[PDB]
Amino acid sequence: VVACFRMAPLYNLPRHRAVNLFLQGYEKSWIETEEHYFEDKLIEDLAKPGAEPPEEDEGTKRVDPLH
Amino acid sequence: DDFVAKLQDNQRFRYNEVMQALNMSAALTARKTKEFRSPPQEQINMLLNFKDDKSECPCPEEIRDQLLDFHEDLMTHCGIE
């Protein structure tokens, strides 16, 4: 009961240990949960043939970056 | 560094408040001290729930806003928005 009551509150922990614990907790809780949607735009940009007629290929049409 | 220093000081103050206020209610004291009895990883994960609007973490508004500013500064640096 003494260990639970007075041991392992993070205000008693040294600064660096609590900083490391905060780093791990911040990672899991915030950075992993942070969600942004880019796949449609990325695939559209990759699928776009970039200035193929302006570019002098004088041959078969070049495969797009997605291809 | 400073975020954890402020969080530790606030948890010190809250523990002092609980040690002052346990005498009104002994049963509610267990619910108050669950945080302090939890393992430190659980304590930090509990204190870091002020994302979203669930907002059950025992964190003050100013300490909350410090990270709710640093996080968007970090997203701006990373190019998210």
Swiss-Prot record, chain B:
Cell location: Sarcoplasmic reticulum membrane
Stimuli inducing this protein: By TGFB1.
PTM comment: Channel activity is modulated by phosphorylation. Phosphorylation is increased in failing heart, leading to calcium leaks and increased cytoplasmic Ca(2+) levels.
Tissue: Detected in heart muscle (at protein level). Heart muscle, brain (cerebellum and hippocampus) and placenta.
Purpose: Cytosolic calcium-activated calcium channel that mediates the release of Ca(2+) from the sarcoplasmic reticulum into the cytosol and thereby plays a key role in triggering cardiac muscle contraction. Aberrant channel activation can lead to cardiac arrhythmia. In cardiac myocytes, calcium release is triggered by increased Ca(2+) cytosolic levels due to activation of the L-type calcium channel CACNA1C. The calcium channel activity is modulated by formation of heterotetramers with RYR3. Required for cellular calcium ion homeostasis. Required for embryonic heart development.
Family: Belongs to the ryanodine receptor (TC 1.A.3.1) family. RYR2 subfamily.
Subunit structure: Homotetramer. Can also form heterotetramers with RYR1 and RYR3. Interacts with FKBP1A and FKBP1B; these interactions may stabilize the channel in its closed state and prevent Ca(2+) leaks. Interacts with CALM and S100A1; these interactions regulate channel activity. Identified in a complex composed of RYR2, FKBP1B, PKA catalytic subunit, PRKAR2A, AKAP6, and the protein phosphatases PP2A and PP1. Interacts directly with FKBP1B, PKA, PP1 and PP2A. Interacts with SELENON. In cardiac muscles, identified in a complex, composed of FSD2, CMYA5 and RYR2.
Entry note about domains: The calcium release channel activity resides in the C-terminal region while the remaining part of the protein resides in the cytoplasm.
Disease (UniProt): Ventricular tachycardia, catecholaminergic polymorphic, 1, with or without atrial dysfunction and/or dilated cardiomyopathy: An arrhythmogenic disorder characterized by stress-induced, bidirectional ventricular tachycardia that may degenerate into cardiac arrest and cause sudden death. Patients present with recurrent syncope, seizures, or sudden death after physical activity or emotional stress. CPVT1 inheritance is autosomal dominant. Ventricular arrhythmias due to cardiac ryanodine receptor calcium release deficiency syndrome: An autosomal dominant arrhythmogenic disorder characterized by syncope, cardiac arrest and/or sudden unexpected death, often in association with physical exertion or acute emotional stress. Patients who survive manifest polymorphic ventricular tachycardia and ventricular fibrillation. Unlike typical catecholaminergic ventricular tachycardia, arrhythmias are not reproducible on exercise stress testing or adrenaline challenge.
Identification of the protein by name: Ryanodine receptor 2
Name of the gene this protein is made from: RYR2
